[PDB]
Structures are given as structure tokens and as C-alpha cells.
Write a protein that binds this ligand. Structure first.
Ligand SMILES: C=C(F)[C@](C)(CCC=C(C)C)OP(=O)(O)OP(=O)(O)O
Ligand SMILES: C=C(F)[C@](C)(CCC=C(C)C)OP(=O)(O)OP(=O)(O)O
Ligand SMILES: [Mn+2]
Ligand SMILES: [Mn+2]
Ligand SMILES: [Mn+2]
Ligand SMILES: [Mn+2]
Ligand SMILES: [Mn+2]
Ligand SMILES: [Mn+2]
Lengths: 543, 543
């Protein structure tokens, strides 16, 4: 009679979840690490070779310590940038180096520095093609490929630099060039460039590789391992509170057609809100995400057209005073929602001084509205077209929802204008949700549409230009590259009204999805590799 | 130009309130009692001397074990009552004995058995009047004074009895030293008869008094103390949940003109909802009683007539939209309230299957309205008539709010009909509040008004008949005595839509108020001994 889209039980249960208690929640570490830092710090800024620096910054970064050496990262990069006079389009053609240049470019750009693509010019022959010689320089070559990802449309030099350094890198992988311990790092970046790699869920491995490194330093490595463990604790704390909420709702038993996976839901935020100081957002998100998950299954799995249309209206007019008109299962959910946004608008009001209920309330209305149109197409046995779908797609994924909720928590002082801009669903939001979406649709088009659901990119395209899924798969991949360019441009935009942290969660959300859906769903049914990534960053300690 | 009724700070901090942990929480404790029980349960069901039984029945109760002996109490009093022919219209031939009769009356009536007042007839002399001889049976002359409180208006015999037995008890205490113990355990009942004594916050002293009782049994005395501690742990647990909530609202820092006393607010409930099963109700109430305090201080202390007339109207129409028009502190207060009832109706809707938000909202609306008319008179510099006031007072004290809230968490299943009866504010609710009210107005009269507040019961009588405080004091007391009598008929009523546990809390809310408001202002603000009874009921363990 119904139509449940067969799901599975959260791999982790309360006893484990609710038990969790790492002995890193003590100040002993906090402070040891808090002193071990000042070292790594002064080590850092006592160093002399600018590249030596660029080199540490990237590592400290890829290791999760990014949080403590903030201002260092700046001045260091700040000077370098303008003590190299990187702020000039007209290249001085000092006939620089592929490596240090690819690096200083990468980091500088990543930190919002204007660095003309022209820079990489002193590395190309006459035909304008990249120098033949470069061929021989695996190191710096891998450094350029990696930097060819801080581009925008109208950046052909970076574009091709990538490609050059790509045929190279790969073939060299099949061969060697050097190491064997390079033949992985190289292939590592060659799977997901650093710029598209989310730090947190990836530090460990990086901390390994570094511990190993001969030139490796111990203060740092020690700082690295300690802190990694000092934050795991945090996640564990948050995780529980978010768990407590999930259990309360009782959807798990009162709404079982919906996916049970609150760890997965909380975990996403260990990747999106990297700045540890934002515990609340992380917690909240654990919830926002769970909620969404349930609402989504109610729309594309459980619920009926009648039921949805009405669910969709009640939310629209946020009529809790009719909560008594919907199927009991929709009453529990909506009340839950009402309860969540209301509780959330309270903390925010309590701490920031604003009544944001009218906004958060909106975030949900629109989401649902989008969920609806998909349901209408679906039931209406409708078949959109790549563009038609895509325009709805980036909103039915919740990125905007997830992101508008975060804004209020991550931002310490908003305006109204900002809020308002943000809420037209600011381009940032738009592009960050698009990655989320596309990536998702990449690793979840399968059972998705083959278990009841409207067509997704892959299909929509496949049908659109009557092609193969391999072509569909390629296209979608390309789209993701396009949107990243638009995003890069926006994350660095000066006119951006958003603060560094927020725009930071917008980019990272894109990068998190690129992990989660890099193989499976990490949700619906889950995926080992994902499962492990989770156990290792949420539950297992480091050495 | 606010007013701030200058309050005092909760004598118990965060850390304390947040830490404490009686190991009794350890399951390996329950079971011990779970045996002692079956034991004490047998000594019971194996006893033969009826008077001996009843006797123990009274102890088990007065000691706080009432919870796991219910069905015993039922069978027993049931039988005794039948094989004694208490249901028959008369039976006074002059065979009865003060004691065992004054006692079987009590427990029989108390447990809802209908036993004529004419039983004590067999104890009166010629011109009627209780027999003089028995001016000797001091023992059973206490059991009489004791049962005289299980009356209604139409029962003059019990009225006189109390009149009589006192005359003597009154003196037997100015004797030489019979038992000495007696002297106190007499004067004990003479301060507050047993009927008006909440058991829970009173077991201690009784468990002591019973230890000594040569005619004692150890399995019972052992289960007794064990349970007290096994129970006190519970409270400590519930205590925190409310505390956590209380802390989270941040009223302490944001609504600082409001009384700080969540412990006290939780404590009240240790003695209203006495059946250990209703943990959530006790927990919820920890919050309700808190919301009120705050929302109350907003009305008789801080807030202005513009601000109150508006607070009241919004609450009434209950819209979280116009919320943006309220003064800041009211914005926060309302949202929390909204969140409170909204979160409470959820749990109810969840576990019981119904939407109660519409009824709970009410509970508050009426309270606030009631609180308003008091504000109006006050500012309106109007001095009401004892009755006028009295007609508001029993509602404006929150009794009905407290209770309508309880009802849902205590009642397993109800119906619109019951609910509705309940909400017209059923007599039971009216009686219980009055006691609460008058009792409060006694130990909060000449101290609240003398700092800004409407004239209370006392003061109103005072003017009405232009009498003295003793006359008012005397009246109000008499008044409390009258109400109880209606109460007595309502709790025992066989027409009550209300179910056992609820009817209890209602009765107990009355008795709990006669405790707190006995020495000075119990509740909070500044409790005399009230404090000890609190540390002792919630923090110190028993031998
Ligand atoms: C929960 C998932 F992982 C998604 C992606 C929904 C979006 C919410 C997240 C990621 C917390 O599930 P699903 O792809 O089935 O939703 P969709 O129906 O929009 O495709
Ligand atoms: C304790 C009282 F009965 C109140 C009403 C506060 C609320 C307490 C509960 C629900 C146990 O204190 P107070 O007597 O000062 O209120 P009032 O100003 O109406 O007399
Ligand atoms: Mn969907
Ligand atoms: Mn879905
Ligand atoms: Mn999907
Ligand atoms: Mn008042
Ligand atoms: Mn008051
Ligand atoms: Mn008072």
C-alpha cells in the first residue's frame, strides 16, 4: 500500500554513541598543546626562507591546526605576496620556479590574494605552450597541477597548466619519476586536488605522511597528533547532544520509513564547520540534517501527492493551528520542525539579540516547496530536462537551508541587508549547493531513480542529448568544475557580504559532498570507505 | 523607575546542583528493596490483628513506601471495611474503642471508603457530648483528633470530636512527661494534622520516630530508609533536567528582576507528584513553576501597565509574530514560554498521541489575564473586596496552570469531555488552588504588599471589616479549613472524571503549600527552615 524506499539501521547505536568518552576532554592536553603551539609558532615565524614557510603553512593547514596559526598564516603570506610583488599583472619574468611559484600562487590565492594568471608565463615556450623542460620536475609539476585549481573562467593559462602537468604526473605515476611514496601523494592529489579536498576528515593520513617525512619536525607533529585528538573529543561531545535531540524526536520508531543516520548527519558538519569554535552550529546541523533527511524521505519515498500537497501548504503558511489536519506522521514531523526552528531562533535571540524565526521558518518553506515540485513531476510521471531539473535541483538538496541556518550561527553580527541578500539565496549559496547537489546526484542517481524518484542530472542529461551514462557522468563532472570556478571567484570576492567563516562553510560544504559522494551515499545505504572515514575521525584516536 | 522587588539568589549554585550523585541511582539498590518489599509485603498480608495491620498501613505510608503496597492497602482496608460493616447506616451499640475506630475511620475515609460520621456516636454521653471517661485514652484520643480532619460541612460529630480531643491533647502536652515522645508526636499532629501533612518531604522524621518504636520491625525499617535514598537519587536526577533547562533560558542574566529559585521550584513537586512514576511531570513542573515565577515577577514587580497590557494581549492572541513589538525582556519570556508548551505538547503528542498545545496555551493565557487584573487594580490604586479578590486570587496564584499541566502528564488517557471539565476549572482544581492561595497569602501577606502588590486575603479582610490581622489570620485559617472540606468530598467523589493520581497531586499541592508557607515564604525569595527540609529531602542521605 505504501512505498518505503528500503533503508538500513544506523550502523552506530546509542550505547556506543551515548557512552563515548575520550580522555582528551581534559585541560592537561589542551594546555600542553596550547604551549606546544607557541613553539610551532615561533618555529614558523622565526624561519627565514619564504618557501620554507609556504611549505609549513600548507602542512600545518592540511593537518587541522589551521585554527591556531591564523594571523601567522596571514602576515607570512601577506608579506611574501608583496615582497615578491605578486600584486602585478605585468610579469617581471624573473624566470621563477614551477614549484615555489605554483605554491606561493596556490596559498596566496587560496587566502584571497590577487595573483595574475600571467605569473605562470615565464614557464612557457614560444608557441605559448608550457615549456618542454618542465617535463623534468615531478615535484614542482605536482605543485602546478594543484594550483591550476584556484582558477576562474577566463583563465586559460591555469586551465592548460593543469592539463600539462597532468599527462605528465599520471604517466610518471605509471613509471615513477622518483620515490614510490610520491607515486601515491601524487596520485592522491591526482584523485582529488587539495583545493577540492576537505581538511578535517583528511588530516590523519596527512599527519601520517608527515610524521614519516625525514625533514619532519616533532613539535609540530606532536602538536598535530595532540590537537587532532583534542578535537575528536569535541566532536564526541557535540555528537551526543545532537544524539540526545534525535532520540527525543522518536522518529526512529515513530517515523521508520525515514533514514536512520544521525552520526552520518552530524559527521557532515565535521567537514563543513572546520572552525572548532562553532560547536553550536555543528550540533544544530546534526539536527538540521537529520530533519531534512526525514522530510526528504517523507517526500520522495513515503508520503502521497495529497499528503504532500497539504504538508507542503501547512508548512508554507506555518499553520501549527491545523497541525491536526495532517496524517499523524506529518504532525509529529512538523511539530518537530516548529520545535527546532523555535528553539534555534531562541538561542540566536538569546545570544545575538534577533528574532530570526521568520527567516529560518522561510528556509524550510522553500525547501519543502522544492521537494514538492520534484514530487509533482515524479507522480505526474514528468520528465524534466537537465536545465529544468537543475534549477530546482540546487534548492531541493537543501544547501540553501543548511547554509542559511549556519549563517546566523557562524556570523556574530548580521545586518538585514546581508540576511536579505543571503536569502535571495546568494550566488555563493547557489554555487555551493550546486556542488553538493551534482556530487550527490553523481553517487546517488542509481537506486535514487531506480527505487522511485524523479530523474537526476545523469538521467536528465542522458535523455536530453540522448547519450550514455558515461557521457552524462562526464558532463556532470564538468559542470562541477564550472561551478567551482564561479565559487572561487565568489569566495574571494570583495563585495561579498559574508564573513570569512561563513563563506568558509559554503566552500567546505562543496568539498564535503565531494568526499561523501566520492563513492556511494554515506547516507541512504552508506559506503565502507565513508564508514571508515567516520569511525576514524569521530571514534578512533591517533598515535 | 522599574520597582524590582529586590530579591535574593538561589542558595544553591551551578556546580553543586550540576554535580551531586547519590549512588542509589545504582540498580543494585532497587533489587535489595525489591526483596525487602516482598518481605514487608508478607508481614503485612500475613498479619491477623486488623488493628495491627491498619497500624502498619499507616506507617508504610507516613514513611513513604506507599508506592509498592497499593494493592495491599486496597485488599486490606477493603476487607476490614466489609467485615466490620462500615457500609451499614449505623452499628453504634457502645462496643467501639476510640483508637482502633478513630484510626480505621481515617484510613478507610482517606482511601475513599464511605463511612458514616455516626460511628463516633457510640462515644458520646447523655446530653450527646463525647464521653468524659475517654478523657483518659490519650492514645486513641489522638487517633480521633486525627480522623476529625476527614470531614465535610454536614458532619458535626467529627467537628466536635476535634473540638474535644484537642481540649485534652492540648493539655496532655503540659503534663509531666508521658513518653515525652508522645508529647512531641502529639504536639506534632497538633501543628498540622496528618491529613494536611505531605508525606514525601516528611518521611525522614517519621522514619526516625519509627526506628525507636520498640514495637518495630527491621525489614520494614530497612526497606524504609533504603527507598528514601533510592528515591532521593531520582529527584537529584530530575532536578538537573529542570536545572539544565533553567540555565539554558538564561533568565538569570536576562530577566534578573525575576526570582532565582529553580531548586525550590523543582522541590515543590517532590511533594505534589508523589508517585515516583511521574518523573517527567515532576521534571516538567520544575520548569512550569519556574516560568510562572518569572512571568509573575514581571507582573507584580518589574513591568509597567503598558508593558503588561500588551504582554497580556499578545499571550492571549498568542502570536509569535507580533513578538517583535514586545519589550525585549518580554520577547525572551514569551518565546521560552512558547517553546515550553510547544516542547511539552510534543512529548505528550508523542507518547500519548494528542495535540495539547491549544489547551496548554490556554492555561497560560488565563493565568496572565488573571495576573493582569491584579496589575490593573494595583496601578489603578484600587482596593478590592475580600471576595472580589478571592475570586481572582485562586486563579492568579497559578494553581489551575500548575494542575491543568499536570493532568496531562499524569493521566494515561483522557477525553475532550474530561479535558473540558477540567478546564472550566473543575472544583477539584478550584479547591486545591484556594488552599495553595490562602496558605501563600498567610506567609506572604504583610511582606509582599509592603513593597508593591495588590492587597492579599489578609489585608482585604482587614479593611473589609476593618479588623485586626489576627482576625484576618483567624479568618483566612478558618477559610482554609472550609475549602479542605469541599476538597475532601471532591477527591473521594465517585463522580470525579479525574483519575486517582491526578486527584492526588491536586490534594498534595494543597498540602505542600501548607508546608512551604508554614514558617515564612517557603517557595523561594527567602525560606527559613524551609531550606533544611529541602537540603534534607534533596541532598542529605538517610541512615
Ligand atoms: C541527506 C543526504 F545525504 C541527501 C543528499 C539529502 C541532502 C541532505 C544532506 C546531505 C544532509 O540525500 P538524498 O540525495 O537522497 O536527497 P535528494 O532526494 O535531494 O537526492
Ligand atoms: C510559589 C508561589 F505560590 C508563587 C506564585 C510563585 C510560583 C510558585 C509555584 C508554582 C510553586 O509565588 P508568590 O506567592 O510570590 O506569587 P504571588 O505574587 O501571586 O503571591
Ligand atoms: Mn528528494
Ligand atoms: Mn531522496
Ligand atoms: Mn540523491
Ligand atoms: Mn502576582
Ligand atoms: Mn508575587
Ligand atoms: Mn504571595
Amino acid at each position: 500500500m505504501r512505498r518505503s524506499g528500503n533503508y538500513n539501521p544506523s550502523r552506530w547505536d546509542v550505547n556506543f554513541i551515548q557512552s563515548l568518552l575520550s580522555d582528551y576532554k581534559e585541560d592537561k592536553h589542551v594546555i600542553r598543546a596550547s604551549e606546544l603551539v607557541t613553539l610551532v609558532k615561533m618555529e614558523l615565524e622565526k624561519e627565514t626562507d619564504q618557501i620554507r614557510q609556504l611549505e609549513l603553512i600548507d602542512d600545518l593547514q592540511r593537518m587541522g591546526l589551521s585554527d591556531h596559526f591564523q594571523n601567522e598564516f596571514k602576515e607570512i603570506l601577506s608579506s611574501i605576496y608583496l615582497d615578491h610583488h605578486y600584486y602585478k599583472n605585468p610579469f617581471p619574468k624573473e624566470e621563477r620556479d614551477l614549484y615555489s611559484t605554483s605554491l606561493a600562487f596556490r596559498l596566496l590565492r587560496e587566502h584571497g590574494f590577487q595573483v595574475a594568471q600571467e605569473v605562470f608565463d615565464s614557464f612557457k615556450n614560444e608557441e605559448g605552450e608550457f615549456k618542454e623542460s618542465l617535463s623534468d620536475d615531478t615535484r614542482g609539476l605536482l605543485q602546478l597541477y594543484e594550483a591550476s585549481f584556484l582558477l576562474t573562467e577566463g583563465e586559460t593559462t591555469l586551465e592548460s597548466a593543469r592539463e600539462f602537468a597532468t599527462k605528465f604526473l599520471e604517466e610518471k605515476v605509471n613509471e615513477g619519476g622518483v620515490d614510490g611514496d610520491l607515486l601515491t601523494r601524487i596520485a592522491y592529489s591526482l584523485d582529488i586536488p587539495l583545493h577540492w579536498r576537505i581538511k578535517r576528515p583528511n588530516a590523519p593520513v596527512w599527519i601520517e605522511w608527515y610524521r614519516k617525512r625525514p625533514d619532519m619536525n616533532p613539535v609540530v607533529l606532536e602538536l598535530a597528533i595532540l590537537d587532532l585528538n583534542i578535537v575528536q573529543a569535541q566532536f564526541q561531545e557535540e555528537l551526543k547532544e545532537s544524539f540526545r535531540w534525535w532520540r527525543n524526536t522518536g522518529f526512529v520508531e515513530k517515523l521508520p520509513f525515514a533514514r536512520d543516520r544521525l552520526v552520518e548527519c552530524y559527521f557532515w558538519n565535521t567537514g563543513i564547520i572546520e572552525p572548532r569554535q562553532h560547536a553550536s552550529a555543528r550540533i544544530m546541523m546534526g539536527k538540521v540534517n537529520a530533519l531534512i533527511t526525514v522530510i526528504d524521505d517523507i517526500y520522495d519515498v513515503y508520503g502521497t501527492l495529497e499528503e504532500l500537497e497539504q504538508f507542503t501548504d501547512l508548512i508554507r503558511r506555518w499553520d501549527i493551528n491545523s497541525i491536526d489536519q495532517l496524517p499523524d506522521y506529518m504532525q509529529l514531523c512538523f511539530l518537530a520542525l516548529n520545535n527546532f526552528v523555535d528553539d534555534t531562533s531562541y538561542d540566536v535571540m538569546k545570544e545575538k539579540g534577533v528574532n530570526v524565526i521568520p527567516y529560518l521558518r522561510q528556509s524550510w518553506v522553500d525547501l519543502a516547496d522544492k521537494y514538492m515540485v520534484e514530487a509533482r513531476w515524479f507522480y505526474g510521471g514528468h520528465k524534466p530536462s537537465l536545465e529544468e531539473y537543475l534549477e530546482n535541483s540546487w534548492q531541493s538538496i537543501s544547501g540553501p537551508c543548511m547554509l542559511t541556518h549556519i549563517f546566523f550561527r557562524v556570523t556574530d553580527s548580521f545586518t538585514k541587508e546581508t540576511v536579505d541578500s543571503l536569502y535571495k539565496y546568494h550566488d555563493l549559496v547557489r554555487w555551493s549547493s550546486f556542488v553538493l547537489r551534482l556530487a550527490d546526484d553523481l553517487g546517488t542517481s542509481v537506486e535514487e531513480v531506480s527505487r522511485g524518484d524523479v530523474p537526476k542530472s545523469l538521467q536528465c542529461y542522458m535523455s536530453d542529448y540522448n547519450a550514455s551514462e558515461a557521457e552524462a557522468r562526464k558532463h556532470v563532472k564538468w559542470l562541477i568544475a564550472e561551478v567551482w570556478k564561479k565559487m572561487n571567484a565568489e569566495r574571494v570576492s570583495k563585495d561579498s557580504p559574508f564573513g570569512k567563516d561563513f563563506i568558509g562553510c559554503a566552500v567546505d560544504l562543496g568539498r564535503m559532498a565531494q568526499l561523501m559522494y566520492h563513492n556511494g551515499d554515506g547516507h541512504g545505504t552508506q559506503h565502507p570507505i565513508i564508514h571508515q572515514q567516520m569511525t576514524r575521525t569521530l571514534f578512533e584516536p591517533f598515535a
